Design an enzyme around this catalytic site. Structure first.
Site, PDB file in Angstrom:
ATOM      1  N   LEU A 130       0.845  -1.244   0.000  1.00 48.37           N
ATOM      2  CA  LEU A 130       0.000   0.000   0.000  1.00 48.37           C
ATOM      3  C   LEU A 130       0.866   1.275   0.000  1.00 48.37           C
ATOM      4  CD1 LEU A 130      -2.994  -1.074   0.093  1.00 48.37           C
ATOM      5  CD2 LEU A 130      -1.787  -1.950   1.960  1.00 48.37           C
TER       6      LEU A 130
ATOM      7  N   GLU B 103      -9.042   0.677   8.953  1.00 47.06           N
ATOM      8  CA  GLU B 103      -9.299   0.567   7.438  1.00 47.06           C
ATOM      9  C   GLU B 103      -9.160  -0.932   7.197  1.00 47.06           C
ATOM     10  OE1 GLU B 103      -8.412   0.061   3.971  1.00 47.06           O
ATOM     11  OE2 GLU B 103     -10.492   0.679   3.707  1.00 47.06           O
TER      12      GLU B 103
HETATM   13  N1  LIG Z   1      -5.507   0.154  -1.927  1.00 51.82           N
HETATM   14  C1  LIG Z   1      -6.196  -0.917  -2.253  1.00 51.82           C
HETATM   15  O1  LIG Z   1      -7.397  -1.102  -2.185  1.00 51.82           O
HETATM   16  C2  LIG Z   1      -5.590  -2.075  -3.073  1.00 51.82           C
HETATM   17  C3  LIG Z   1      -4.257  -2.016  -3.179  1.00 51.82           C
HETATM   18  N2  LIG Z   1      -3.671  -3.156  -3.909  1.00 51.82           N
HETATM   19  C4  LIG Z   1      -2.184  -2.977  -4.157  1.00 51.82           C
HETATM   20  O2  LIG Z   1      -2.187  -2.615  -5.614  1.00 51.82           O
HETATM   21  C5  LIG Z   1      -1.065  -3.413  -6.240  1.00 51.82           C
HETATM   22  C6  LIG Z   1      -1.598  -4.758  -6.881  1.00 51.82           C
HETATM   23  O3  LIG Z   1      -1.604  -4.437  -8.246  1.00 51.82           O
HETATM   24  P1  LIG Z   1      -1.998  -4.724  -9.726  1.00 51.82           P
HETATM   25  O4  LIG Z   1      -0.786  -4.770 -10.428  1.00 51.82           O
HETATM   26  O5  LIG Z   1      -2.947  -3.883 -10.375  1.00 51.82           O
HETATM   27  O6  LIG Z   1      -2.276  -6.380  -9.717  1.00 51.82           O
HETATM   28  P2  LIG Z   1      -3.323  -7.544  -9.823  1.00 51.82           P
HETATM   29  O7  LIG Z   1      -3.375  -7.987  -8.445  1.00 51.82           O
HETATM   30  O8  LIG Z   1      -4.425  -7.141 -10.593  1.00 51.82           O
HETATM   31  O9  LIG Z   1      -2.261  -8.608 -10.571  1.00 51.82           O
HETATM   32  C7  LIG Z   1      -2.126  -8.527 -12.029  1.00 51.82           C
HETATM   33  C8  LIG Z   1      -2.020 -10.061 -12.375  1.00 51.82           C
HETATM   34  O10 LIG Z   1      -3.134 -10.678 -12.154  1.00 51.82           O
HETATM   35  C9  LIG Z   1      -3.684 -11.490 -13.213  1.00 51.82           C
HETATM   36  N3  LIG Z   1      -4.843 -10.882 -13.720  1.00 51.82           N
HETATM   37  C10 LIG Z   1      -5.196  -9.576 -13.498  1.00 51.82           C
HETATM   38  N4  LIG Z   1      -6.316  -9.300 -14.100  1.00 51.82           N
HETATM   39  C11 LIG Z   1      -6.712 -10.529 -14.762  1.00 51.82           C
HETATM   40  C12 LIG Z   1      -7.873 -11.086 -15.641  1.00 51.82           C
HETATM   41  N5  LIG Z   1      -8.969 -10.408 -16.081  1.00 51.82           N
HETATM   42  N6  LIG Z   1      -7.768 -12.356 -16.071  1.00 51.82           N
HETATM   43  C13 LIG Z   1      -6.774 -13.124 -15.671  1.00 51.82           C
HETATM   44  N7  LIG Z   1      -5.687 -12.731 -14.962  1.00 51.82           N
HETATM   45  C14 LIG Z   1      -5.757 -11.386 -14.513  1.00 51.82           C
HETATM   46  C15 LIG Z   1      -2.476 -11.505 -14.284  1.00 51.82           C
HETATM   47  O11 LIG Z   1      -1.631 -12.449 -13.698  1.00 51.82           O
HETATM   48  P3  LIG Z   1      -0.633 -13.231 -14.888  1.00 51.82           P
HETATM   49  O12 LIG Z   1       0.454 -12.259 -15.059  1.00 51.82           O
HETATM   50  O13 LIG Z   1      -0.200 -14.276 -13.961  1.00 51.82           O
HETATM   51  O14 LIG Z   1      -1.586 -13.686 -15.918  1.00 51.82           O
HETATM   52  C16 LIG Z   1      -1.928 -10.051 -14.008  1.00 51.82           C
HETATM   53  O15 LIG Z   1      -0.437  -9.991 -14.375  1.00 51.82           O
HETATM   54  C17 LIG Z   1      -0.146  -3.853  -4.989  1.00 51.82           C
HETATM   55  O16 LIG Z   1       0.831  -2.759  -5.011  1.00 51.82           O
HETATM   56  C18 LIG Z   1      -1.189  -4.128  -3.918  1.00 51.82           C
HETATM   57  O17 LIG Z   1      -0.621  -3.990  -2.652  1.00 51.82           O
HETATM   58  C19 LIG Z   1      -4.354  -4.281  -4.493  1.00 51.82           C
HETATM   59  C20 LIG Z   1      -5.734  -4.239  -4.380  1.00 51.82           C
HETATM   60  C21 LIG Z   1      -6.495  -3.207  -3.567  1.00 51.82           C
HETATM   61  C1  LIG Z   2      -3.679  -5.086  -0.233  1.00 51.75           C
HETATM   62  N1  LIG Z   2      -4.966  -5.709   0.258  1.00 51.75           N
HETATM   63  C2  LIG Z   2      -6.096  -4.967  -0.538  1.00 51.75           C
HETATM   64  C3  LIG Z   2      -6.634  -3.900   0.466  1.00 51.75           C
HETATM   65  C4  LIG Z   2      -6.056  -3.427   1.552  1.00 51.75           C
HETATM   66  O1  LIG Z   2      -6.786  -2.487   2.121  1.00 51.75           O
HETATM   67  C5  LIG Z   2      -7.840  -2.461   1.458  1.00 51.75           C
HETATM   68  N2  LIG Z   2      -8.857  -1.660   1.896  1.00 51.75           N
HETATM   69  C6  LIG Z   2      -9.858  -1.660   0.987  1.00 51.75           C
HETATM   70  N3  LIG Z   2     -10.882  -0.735   1.419  1.00 51.75           N
HETATM   71  N4  LIG Z   2     -10.006  -2.344  -0.041  1.00 51.75           N
HETATM   72  C7  LIG Z   2      -9.061  -3.246  -0.368  1.00 51.75           C
HETATM   73  N5  LIG Z   2      -9.283  -3.881  -1.441  1.00 51.75           N
HETATM   74  C8  LIG Z   2      -7.917  -3.254   0.328  1.00 51.75           C
HETATM   75  C9  LIG Z   2      -5.092  -6.431   1.394  1.00 51.75           C
HETATM   76  C10 LIG Z   2      -3.936  -6.777   2.128  1.00 51.75           C
HETATM   77  C11 LIG Z   2      -3.877  -7.564   3.251  1.00 51.75           C
HETATM   78  C12 LIG Z   2      -5.044  -8.061   3.815  1.00 51.75           C
HETATM   79  C13 LIG Z   2      -5.178  -8.735   4.950  1.00 51.75           C
HETATM   80  O2  LIG Z   2      -4.224  -9.058   5.620  1.00 51.75           O
HETATM   81  N6  LIG Z   2      -6.460  -8.915   5.409  1.00 51.75           N
HETATM   82  C14 LIG Z   2      -6.784  -9.565   6.712  1.00 51.75           C
HETATM   83  C15 LIG Z   2      -6.973  -8.287   7.612  1.00 51.75           C
HETATM   84  C16 LIG Z   2      -7.269  -8.600   9.023  1.00 51.75           C
HETATM   85  C17 LIG Z   2      -6.813  -7.484   9.940  1.00 51.75           C
HETATM   86  O3  LIG Z   2      -6.466  -6.379   9.543  1.00 51.75           O
HETATM   87  O4  LIG Z   2      -6.754  -7.970  11.101  1.00 51.75           O
HETATM   88  C18 LIG Z   2      -8.203 -10.104   6.584  1.00 51.75           C
HETATM   89  O5  LIG Z   2      -8.679 -11.046   7.269  1.00 51.75           O
HETATM   90  O6  LIG Z   2      -8.990  -9.500   5.817  1.00 51.75           O
HETATM   91  C19 LIG Z   2      -6.198  -7.758   3.113  1.00 51.75           C
HETATM   92  C20 LIG Z   2      -6.163  -7.007   1.933  1.00 51.75           C
END
Ligand SMILES: NC(=O)C1=CN([C@@H]2O[C@H](COP(=O)(O)OP(=O)(O)OC[C@H]3O[C@@H](n4cnc5c(N)ncnc54)[C@H](OP(=O)(O)O)[C@@H]3O)[C@@H](O)[C@H]2O)C=CC1
Ligand SMILES: CN(Cc1coc2nc(N)nc(N)c12)c1ccc(C(=O)N[C@@H](CCC(=O)O)C(=O)O)cc1
Length: 186
Positions: free
Chosen positions: A22, A30
């Protein structure tokens, strides 16, 4: 089967991740809210499905993998089998949704939660049908390398309130953020 939802935390410059993690320091409350939203099932004897890309799976600390009480599905075209601890592997989002309709899971699953990343969100967002976005607005700019797709406000409406979601500005480690619920139907 039931409801299809996206859930994401975003910075003011639409940033979601920087180097596998993150962009901001950990927000325990959160994280708790992500846990509560995705784990709670509205029906009895039913569990929620969590759908994520592979780099999202690898950013969850190992000690928390698989997310407890949730069916964990990983998306990837490269992987031969689900990573260690993952319950299912799918090659695309249409296939992961074609999967909840298999008697295997059909009687088992209540809600479907998309938990990222960018590529995953983008495609759920264009899928036809009823969808809700659960957006945490982290109110400051954070250097990011991955970004959330633009929310088209001609298609999504911001809801004025939602049951079990706090309406006020939160503050943790000096960071302000707030919770929003967006709804589409086309
Ligand atoms: N703030 C938040 O809510 C969130 C933060 N995060 C963070 O964001 C970043 C994760 O990033 P991001 O790169 O976008 O990665 P994704 O987790 O989306 O990983 C991308 C990989 O997933 C697979 N994939 C993704 N979309 C598809 C699809 N439609 N069909 C099949 N395979 C798919 C492919 O794997 P392959 O290459 O193997 O085919 C692609 O290379 C991290 O830095 C993480 O910590 C993640 C989610 C929520
Ligand atoms: C990077 N992500 C995506 C993520 C983090 O924060 C977010 N917050 C939102 N609102 N949306 C998301 N998709 C995410 C995640 C990373 C780690 C855990 C994780 O450890 N989750 C434990 C959290 C438990 C805890 O915090 O004790 C679980 O049971 O859900 C979850 C999501």
């Amino acid at each position: 089967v039931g409801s299809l939802n996206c859930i994401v935390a975003v910075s003011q410059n639409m940033g979601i991740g920087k180097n596998g993690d993150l962009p901001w320091p950990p927000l325990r409350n959160e994280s708790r809210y992500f846990q509560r939203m995705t784990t709670t099932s509205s029906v009895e004897g039913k569990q929620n499905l969590v759908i994520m890309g592979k780099k999202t799976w690898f950013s969850i600390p190992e000690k928390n993998r698989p997310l407890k009480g949730r069916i964990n599905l990983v998306l990837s075209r490269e992987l031969k089998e689900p990573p260690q601890g993952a319950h299912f592997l799918s090659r695309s989002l249409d296939d992961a949704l074609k999967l909840t309709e298999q008697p295997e899971l059909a009687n088992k699953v209540d809600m479907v939660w998309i938990v990222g990343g960018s590529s995953v969100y983008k495609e759920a967002m264009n899928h036809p049908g009823h969808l809700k976005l659960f957006v945490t607005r982290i109110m400051q700019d954070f250097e990011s390398d991955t970004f959330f797709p633009e929310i088209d406000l001609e298609k999504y409406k911001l809801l004025p309130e939602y049951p079990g979601v706090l309406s006020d500005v939160q503050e943790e480690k000096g960071i302000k953020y707030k919770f929003e619920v967006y709804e589409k139907n086309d």
